[PDB]
RNA sequence: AGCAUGUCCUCCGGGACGAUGGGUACUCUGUGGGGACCGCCGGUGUUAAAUCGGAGGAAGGUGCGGGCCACGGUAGGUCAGUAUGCCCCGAAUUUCCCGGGCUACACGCGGGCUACAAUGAAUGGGACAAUGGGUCCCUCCCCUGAAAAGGGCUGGUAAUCUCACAAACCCAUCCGUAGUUCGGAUCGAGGGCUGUAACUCGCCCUCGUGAAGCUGGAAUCCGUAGUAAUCGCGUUUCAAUAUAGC
């Protein structure tokens, strides 16, 4: 199969980020340049493509982890919160950032609305399988003993 | 060789790049300086020592502007008394307004004025073994 | 001199002056008041000599000028009221 | 298919298993389709307290660990069968729960 | 036909539902190809008994894994013990059992148990506070 | 039942150091005394 | 079968011969695919006699307070130090390490014996397991001291320590500590 | 865990689905049971009581950790958990709220939480742990904001459901050389929910000042295997606040 799991997550997530960058429906909305990745970290992100890569990562997380609510996404997107001389709780992510990313994902049609979050839509699953076949095309010569032999 | 540069009478780290060069100046630290870098249209990671003076002039003008490239929930002087608006000082004016806001309270006999004039904690944490 | 010049501050609204004040005072006034501060407000709006007895209350816009008396463990103390102290707490001046 | 569910969770599991065998023998007498005795997790409720009443005294804590033995069994539904199950002499050490799912 | 055992000695928690079968040779180790096995840093610890079995054996073999939990290193050795047991359950020799016992058992129970139930009087199971 | 120490434990009239845990509402000494009579036991 | 095991899949410990003949029977050149055997040092004592030496050197590198529970970073530093020793000092790298251990392991130690009616420690021979332990301890100390507060990485300083104590470089901390302890043993013969 | 379905890969078993039909094939299972007694064998001790590797064996010879722990003293703590003798208070030392105080601080001392590397700041990756809570309280998803959080609405009398992400971690990697992005105590504006009330006297949140400081002498201290150490986790003091105990 051309599943995503036959390829490393880095190349596939970067491919999904590039395909979302090609799509105009995903954009960094206004407050991307003055808010951090959530509440845990110290500073806003320094990478240029943080919003598209974050949406692609949320897509891959929804695919490999099923339907995920926004607060489950916030819990996944926490961090080692610095308190100075306090015992370093891991709190949450950000509600508005995750919600805007998820709304962009569903407007792109990859995420499917469900009661316990938003499971990934079937079309997104098929297109990401095709992208896995593309990235697996980059390493199709690894194991020749896989077609019907 | 731009080994060291000066901006608005405050010779910042000319060696250090744009994103951290403005943290050394009062009024901006870490978060709001990268907002200035976003507004001025200059990549922070580029070395300031290899920056010709025209772009440095644009950076100086942009940091002089500041408030038009900063949000409204990240200002140190929100709801500043009779002014009412939100401001963000720079230089000696923050300490000047702080000391006047403390000594007028001390004249008016407010509690925070006494706690500032006596060298005590104003937030009320226990003074048992602090500042010995 | 909070939000505007000092002259019109006495005639400002309760919620507008509360928005002039920080979140703590705004929520303190937002969830109603107990009987004691209502009595203090009523007597201030009458004009008799007043011993407030509450060390946490918020100075009002038109309440300024007249002197407030506060119980300080030991019995009472008389304290002046100024434009600088409006919106503050009554116990901030008699430790 | 219709089942009548039995929920018990108590302090003494010996009489619990005895009541389970009594219901099983009642089902085999009445020919009721039965699910076997299923050992559920036991609630190990714990609450400790420092032993020392007075001020001085080193670490002394008597921990009160308590096991609440849970058991879930499923059997069929029938009026005479349910009356037979309701007339069983079950001990006080367990609580008897029923869910008539049809 | 298919081997399903998760007993591995249970390093803390293991949860390794073994699934070893025989087919064309396409081996999918827990929904992951062996060529690009996703854990990577821990697969060196996990590929020991399979390496001892031989490329021809596991190329002949076909294995899947169903999991629930466990710590990362507890997974990394309990799953290896489970794979060793699945190797010996399939029709094979006792030479592989000798080689598996030769290096460091990986068919036994982890003698060091989960934890030790730290008593009141200190932070840890055996450690205590500092006495002046 | 919402307060700092207004509620008292059973038997022992007291406003501090009461076990409100598990809906017991006993002081630690009193609950320690009567746990062996109320079905509690130090099994470990 | 034994599929010709090499350290990190690169360095086979079979084609290495020990110099210190006493330490050969204690330091183990047994082939293991990964240096995470997770030894069993509670059934008896000297359970490390059958355990690998790369694992032991990686777990004696967690001397620091933050290093506890960090066998992954210790193995990372071990691998990059092996790469550095193989590059700048081209040779069998585990052979270089075993030369370093045999050169910086304390042959003699001084122990208190109250004979002659005087409080004086006597100079005694050192056990092979004890000597190997002290060699690994001093190697860890040199690596930690160079790697602390420095522009050079942890694994780089470990490679410097291994090169110093392997090629008999007199500047290494392990060599100087071994010579110091042997000098103190000579002082109390 | 095969039996079969609900959508894609087409190179072809299926990958995903255990919701389900189904199967409890093999397992986790929690009630009853066996196991490993220095029992046999080779040393010692005496031929006794007792003592080492041999066992292909889950633990060989307290398997491994725990509670209960006597006769008595230490006139040790317990009138401040409880009852109680006597002296006393019997309109106060009884008795109910208001305000302050126990937080006040030249200050000596005890124990804890954070800190100076390539063993470190951003961005991802993988599922990860249990103990134990929650129905008068945790929170499902939806909407709103930057945050804390607000509304609505869903699951839970709890192997259902949720607090619930574990962090530490590791890597294409990004990341930089110095006592500074490694390192954060004070204080100034600002927004929060908790409470009947936040100045004394709270915690949450956001911004700007980023300081003191740079592995610490005398002295000590804990600890022998999944234990020290470490990284974070529930629970108890329930209105918040745990750098705390457990
Ligand atoms: Zn009581």
PDB file of C-alpha atoms and ligand atoms in Angstrom, chain F residues 9-10 12 27 30, ligand 1:
ATOM      1  CA  UNK F   9     -16.485  16.155  61.919  1.00  0.00           C
ATOM      2  CA  UNK F  10     -18.729  13.589  63.567  1.00  0.00           C
ATOM      3  CA  UNK F  12     -15.398  15.442  67.773  1.00  0.00           C
ATOM      4  CA  UNK F  27     -11.265  13.988  62.345  1.00  0.00           C
ATOM      5  CA  UNK F  30     -11.422   9.896  65.401  1.00  0.00           C
TER       6      UNK F  30
HETATM    7 ZN1  LIG I   1     -13.858  13.041  65.480  1.00  0.00          ZN
END
